[PDB]
Symmetry: C3
Subunit: 175 residues, 3 copies
Amino acid sequence: MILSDKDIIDYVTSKRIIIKPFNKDFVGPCSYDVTLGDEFIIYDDEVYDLSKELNYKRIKIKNSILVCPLNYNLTEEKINYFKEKYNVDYVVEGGVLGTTNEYIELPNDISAQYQGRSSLGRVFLTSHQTAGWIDAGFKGKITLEIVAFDKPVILYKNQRIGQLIFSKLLSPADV
Amino acid sequence: MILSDKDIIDYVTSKRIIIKPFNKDFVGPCSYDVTLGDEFIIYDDEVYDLSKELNYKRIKIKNSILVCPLNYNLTEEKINYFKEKYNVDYVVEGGVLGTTNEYIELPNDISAQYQGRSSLGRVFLTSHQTAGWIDAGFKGKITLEIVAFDKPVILYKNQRIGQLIFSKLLSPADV
Amino acid sequence: MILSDKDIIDYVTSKRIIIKPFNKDFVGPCSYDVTLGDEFIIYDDEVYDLSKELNYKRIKIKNSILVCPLNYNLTEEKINYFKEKYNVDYVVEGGVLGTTNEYIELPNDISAQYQGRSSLGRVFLTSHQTAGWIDAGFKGKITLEIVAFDKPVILYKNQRIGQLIFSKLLSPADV
């Protein structure tokens, strides 16, 4: 069973589900809206080999980022053009990792699923490459896997980026 | 808990869940198949900035559409080649928005998830860029976020495009 | 309600859910990890028309495969370069189908959802193009829909590739 608005409020009130920061206006009928952080990771190795430690750079934006589809031919002139035209701080192509602002802790009897916002899916911007279920017992911010699939998309710091849907477990998990 | 076939039938019968049109043959073990509409939206601005109103054109197909991956080099000659070879009415690359034929209304105690058809996922055609949970209380057709990720894919008007999975809420939502 | 670890163990023990092979170490708090098979399918027609029978070749790898994003300009020299540098047996671009090692059977009162591993989603490698719910009553291995969206990704035979999440149905399905 999926937690309704009033269940989300109860679970947050009693600290069964931790959400930091929490804004009651982000509680929907059966979900909780989460927001986009200002820190991003971009990988800079040639290939991804998960048997090795991955090299990355960390980027922090002031206000906004333009996320371009893979293979956009981003010359330095094209980047300046986008920065001046759309007032973005950073222009990237292909995948970038972001984070929610929100830190969560899930109890042993709840699993949550992260879903990107449908307004963004309608412009072919994704913030998750998987279905996004999160283990009972999880503690952390949510790592966002961001890719644009059609045209460049402007993302703003602190914008609503996605939602958490909470489900009851049938029985409590071991941790 | 996910509604089984017999639950879907009960909820449709009593008008708890509205599905228009409804075909009982589309009820699966624990889902309801939905179908592809003939109307599509294609964006025609340079970038997607959701702080602004988005400019789009609306396309209506007679029978079928060829959806090509982004950056397919669609010359006007290549388009004619595809139209004559595969008998499609329209050829597009990158993202296009479609719709289900089906209009739904969800009660305060059900959330539904849209999932694209696995026969289509196996040819790398997606009709949703997000996990696809739909709020309790939702009324509307489902907007499809269509992208091909490998080779062009022919889609046919009225074909089964995806499924709705219905879940009980733990408690009724406020609207 | 989602099955916890102890529920997964009960259901496997009594043969309500069949998982072959089964490794108890793959049981998580509320999911079961599945692994990557050594057999892949690659399509070799020009377009995907699901009204026709699809032509494919079958590839079997010894150890590992490099999955490159669509439109990677894989010359035969670039392929040799990747094979020698990263010790992979096969180099592919765009979509490829794989399979889990695990064969499952679901009873009439459970639906399962396949989700790709988050370590892989964080490198923009997907193994499912849909939300991945599987019918109550399903029997089979899980077909993986594999695409890389940023840079090439090495996948290893038998690696953990994704997870199954099991949910109770509200009522038993008819088959």
